[PDB]
C-alpha cells in the first residue's frame, strides 16, 4: 500500500533572540520587569525554532505539535514587532523541498527577511510531516484510519492556505515547492488520499456496494484532477506522477467493481460484465506499467473470478447483451472530506509568550496621540500667556489701574502697594539675584559632565590606536574610533543644546540688568517707597466720574478674565486620557486602528470644554482692550498735563512695568533652572553609557 507524502524543507539556523531583544529594550524601561519576561520569551522562542526545524526528524505527534506550536507562536508575534518596515532585519533561509529550480542546479535556496516566508515554510513542513505520519498509519484498524484521515485533511488545508497567502506574504517569487500551483496540487493529492481512507473504512465496515462505489469514484475524480495538473508541469518529485496515475486507475476500477455488484443484484447482467471488463482492463494496465509502485494482485484475482462467473451465468443461462461503456450511466460521487482551514492556534494547549506585549500599531497610535495632545495643550497655554503679557503691557502703557486709584498724588496707589508687598514676600530682588548668580554654575556643572564624558572616549580611543599600532596581530579589533561614532553624535548635539541654553541665559540676564533698579525700589518698605514716588496735585474732579466707574469695572473684568487663565491652564495640564484600551477595541472589534479620527474625537471630548473657554478669553480680552483704550483716552481729557503729574505718571507706569518684569523674570529663571537640572539627569546617564563602554573595552 503506497501513499504519497512530502519531504520537509531545510532551513539554516538563525539567531532569533537577537533582533528581538534589541528592539524589546529600545522599547521598555531598562531593568524594568517588562523586559524581564519579554526578553525571556524571545529566548524560549529561538530555542523552539531550533527544535521545530533544526532537529533531524522524528515522525510522531510530539515533533508535529512542537512544529504546530511553532507555527502558532510565530503568527502571534507579527503584530507585536515592526517587521512591516522590515527595518528590524532578521533573515530566514530555506531550501527547496524537491530541489526544484528553473535553472539546472539541484538545490535552490532562498533567504528572506520576511516573516511571511518563515510562516509559509513552517506551515508547509507542518503539512508534510502530517502527510508522512498519515502515510504510516495502519489502515487495517479503526484508529489508523481516523489518524490518517485527519492528517491528510490537515495537510490538504495547510497546503491550500499556503496557496492562498504565500505571494501577498512575500515580495518576490517563492521557491517552487511553495508556489501557489505546487501547493494547490499537493492539497488536492492530500484530499484525494483522505477520500481514499474513507473508501477503505467503508470497505472494512462492509457497507453497501452503492456507497463504496460512490466513495471510490469521488477519490478517482480527485486523483484524476491532481493527475491532470501534473501532466504538463513537473514540479513534484519523480515518483509522484506514476503513483497518481496508478491510484486514479485503481480507484476507477474499485468503482467499477462495486457498481458491477449492484448491477448483478438488479439482474443487469450485461452491465455487470461490462463494468468488470473495464475494471480488469484498468487493473491490468496498472499491474504491468506501475508494478514498481503498486500491488494489485488480490484485486485482479477478485475481479477475474467475478468476471469469469458472471460470463458463465450469462453465456449459459441469462444471455443478456453486454453494453458498450459509452452507453452506461455515470457512477455518482460522494465526498466525505474537507481540506481543513488553518485557524491559529493549530497546536493543542497553545499559550502566547508575548500575549501581554502591546500591538505595535497601538503603541504607534498612542505616541501619535500625545504629539497631538501636547500640541493642543501647549497651543492653548502659550496663546493665553501671550495675551496676558499683552494686556499687562497695555495697562502699564496707560498707567492703569494706578491712575484711577491715585486719589491724592500723595501716597502709594493701592495696586502698586499690593504688587510691592507681593514682591517683597517672594523674597524681593535678592531672590532674583540668587537665581541669576547660580545660573552660570548650573551651566558649568553640565559643561563639565559632557566634557569628562567625551574625554573618556578620547582617552580610551587613544590607547586603542596605540595598541593596534604596536601589536597589529594581538590587537585586532574594531577601532574605538568607529565604535564611538554614535556616542560622539549625541555629544555633539548636547553641545548644540548648551549653545541654545547659554543664548537664553544672555537674554534673561540682559532683562535683569535693565529692570533691576526699578524692582529694588518697588521692594522698599511702604513709607520709603512712597517718599521716592514724586508727588502731584490730584484733580479731585475725578472722584465719581463716569469715565472712572466704567474704566474701574472695565478693569475689574479684565482682572477676572486673567486670574481665570490660571485655573484653565492648570486644568489643561491636570487631566489625562489613557487611550490604550480605546485603541485595543478599535483593533479587536476591527481590522485596523485609525488613530487620527479616534484621538481627534477623544481630544474634543476631554479638552474641548477648555479649548473653548480659552478661546473665549482671547476675544473677551480683545473686547476689553478695545473698550479700555477708548474709555481711557477720555479719562485723558480730564487728565491734566502738569509736569508735577507727568513725573508722577512716569514713575507709576514704571513701577507697574517693574512688577510685570519681576514676575516674568522669576519665571524664566525657575524654568531655566528646572531645565539645567533635567539636563544634569540626562547628561549623567550619558556619562554612564560612556564609562560602561570604555570599560567593556
Amino acid at each position: 500500500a503506497t501513499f504519497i507524502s512530502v519531504q520537509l524543507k531545510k532551513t539554516s539556523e538563525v539567531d532569533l533572540a537577537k533582533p528581538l531583544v534589541k528592539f524589546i529594550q529600545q522599547t521598555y524601561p531598562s531593568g524594568g520587569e517588562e523586559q524581564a519576561q519579554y526578553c525571556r520569551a524571545a529566548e524560549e522562542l529561538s530555542k523552539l525554532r531550533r527544535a521545530a526545524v533544526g532537529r533531524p526528524l522524528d515522525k510522531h505527534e510530539g515533533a508535529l505539535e512542537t512544529l504546530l506550536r511553532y507555527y502558532d507562536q510565530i503568527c502571534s508575534i507579527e503584530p507585536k514587532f515592526p517587521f512591516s518596515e522590515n527595518q528590524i532585519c532578521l533573515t530566514f533561509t530555506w531550501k527547496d523541498a524537491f530541489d526544484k529550480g528553473s535553472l539546472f542546479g539541484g538545490s535552490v535556496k532562498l533567504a528572506l527577511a520576511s516573516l511571511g516566508y518563515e510562516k509559509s515554510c513552517v506551515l508547509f513542513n507542518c503539512a508534510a510531516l502530517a502527510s508522512q505520519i498519515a502515510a504510516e498509519q495502519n489502515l487495517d484498524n479503526d484508529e489508523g484510519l481516523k489518524i490518517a484521515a485527519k492528517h491528510y485533511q490537515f495537510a490538504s488545508g495547510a497546503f491550500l492556505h499556503i496557496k492562498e497567502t504565500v505571494l501577498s506574504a512575500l515580495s518576490r517569487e517563492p521557491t517552487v515547492d511553495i508556489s501557489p500551483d505546487t501547493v494547490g496540487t499537493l492539497s488536492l493529492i492530500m484530499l484525494a488520499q483522505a477520500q481514499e481512507v474513507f473508501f477503505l473504512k467503508a470497505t472494512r465496515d462492509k457497507m453497501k456496494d452503492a456507497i463504496i462505489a460512490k466513495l471510490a469514484n469521488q477519490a478517482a475524480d480527485y486523483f484524476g484532477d491532481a493527475f491532470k495538473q501534473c501532466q504538463y508541469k513537473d514540479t513534484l518529485p519523480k515518483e509522484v506522477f506514476p503513483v497518481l496515475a496508478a491510484k486514479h486507475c485503481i480507484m476507477q476500477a474499485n468503482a467499477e467493481y462495486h457498481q458491477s455488484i449492484l448491477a448483478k443484484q438488479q439482474y443487469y447482467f450485461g452491465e455487470e460484465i461490462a463494468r468488470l471488463q473495464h475494471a480488469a482492463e484498468l487493473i491490468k494496465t496498472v499491474a504491468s506499467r506501475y508494478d514498481e509502485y503498486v500491488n494489485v494482485k488480490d484485486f485482479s484475482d477478485k475481479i477475474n473470478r467475478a468476471l469469469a462467473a458472471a460470463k458463465k451465468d450469462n453465456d449459459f443461462i441469462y444471455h443478456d447483451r453486454v453494453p458498450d461503456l459509452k452507453d452506461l450511466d455515470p457512477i455518482g460521487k460522494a465526498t466525505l472530506v474537507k481540506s481543513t482551514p488553518v485557524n491559529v492556534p493549530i497546536s493543542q494547549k497553545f499559550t502566547d509568550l508575548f500575549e501581554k506585549m502591546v500591538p505595535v500599531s497601538v503603541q504607534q497610535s498612542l505616541a501619535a496621540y500625545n504629539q497631538r495632545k501636547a500640541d493642543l495643550v501647549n497651543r492653548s497655554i502659550a496663546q493665553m500667556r501671550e495675551a496676558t503679557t499683552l494686556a499687562n503691557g497695555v495697562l502699564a502703557s496707560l498707567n492703569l489701574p494706578a491712575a484711577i486709584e491715585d486719589v491724592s498724588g500723595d501716597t502709594v496707589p493701592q495696586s502698586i502697594l499690593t504688587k510691592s508687598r507681593s514682591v517683597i514676600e517672594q523674597g524681593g530682588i535678592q531672590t532674583v539675584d540668587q537665581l541669576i548668580k547660580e545660573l552660570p554654575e548650573l551651566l558649568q556643572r553640565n559643561r563639565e559632565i559632557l566634557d569628562e564624558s567625551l574625554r573618556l572616549l578620547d582617552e580610551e580611543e587613544a590607547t586603542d590606536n596605540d595598541l593596534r599600532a604596536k601589536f597589529k596581530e594581538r590587537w585586532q579589533r574594531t577601532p574605538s574610533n568607529e565604535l564611538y561614532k554614535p556616542l560622539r553624535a549625541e555629544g555633539t548635539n548636547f553641545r548644540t543644546v548648551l549653545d541654545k541654553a547659554v543664548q537664553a541665559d544672555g537674554q534673561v540676564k540682559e532683562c535683569y540688568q535693565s529692570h533691576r533698579d526699578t524692582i529694588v525700589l518697588l521692594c522698599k518698605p511702604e513709607p520709603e517707597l512712597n517718599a521716592a514716588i514724586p508727588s502731584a496735585n490730584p484733580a479731585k474732579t475725578m472722584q465719581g466720574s463716569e469715565v472712572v466707574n466704567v474704566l474701574k469695572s472695565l478693569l475689574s473684568n479684565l482682572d477676572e478674565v486673567k486670574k481665570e487663565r490660571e485655573g484653565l491652564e492648570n486644568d489643561l495640564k491636570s487631566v489625562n486620557f489613557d487611550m490604550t484600551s480605546k485603541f485595543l477595541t478599535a483593533l479587536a472589534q476591527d481590522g485596523v486602528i485609525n488613530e487620527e479620527a479616534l484621538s481627534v474625537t477623544e481630544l474634543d471630548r476631554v479638552y474641548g470644554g477648555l479649548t473653548t473657554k480659552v478661546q473665549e478669553s482671547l476675544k473677551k480680552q480683545e473686547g476689553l482692550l478695545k473698550n479700555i483704550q477708548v474709555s481711557h483716552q477720555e479719562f485723558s481729557k480730564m487728565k491734566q498735563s502738569n509736569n508735577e503729574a507727568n513725573l508722577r505718571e512716569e514713575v507709576l507706569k514704571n513701577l507697574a512695568t517693574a512688577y510685570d518684569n519681576f514676575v516674568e523674570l522669576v519665571a524664566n529663571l525657575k524654568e531655566g533652572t528646572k531645565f539645567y537640572n533635567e539636563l544634569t539627569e540626562i547628561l549623567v546617564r550619558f556619562q554612564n553609557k560612556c564609562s560602561d563602554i570604555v570599560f567593556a573595552r
Binding site: 548635539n493 543664548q503 534673561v508 524654568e671 531655566g672
Partner: peptide, 9 residues
Amino acid sequence: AYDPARKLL
C-alpha cells in the same frame, strides 16, 4: 525662554 532649548532634547 528655555523652550527653544528643550526642543533640541
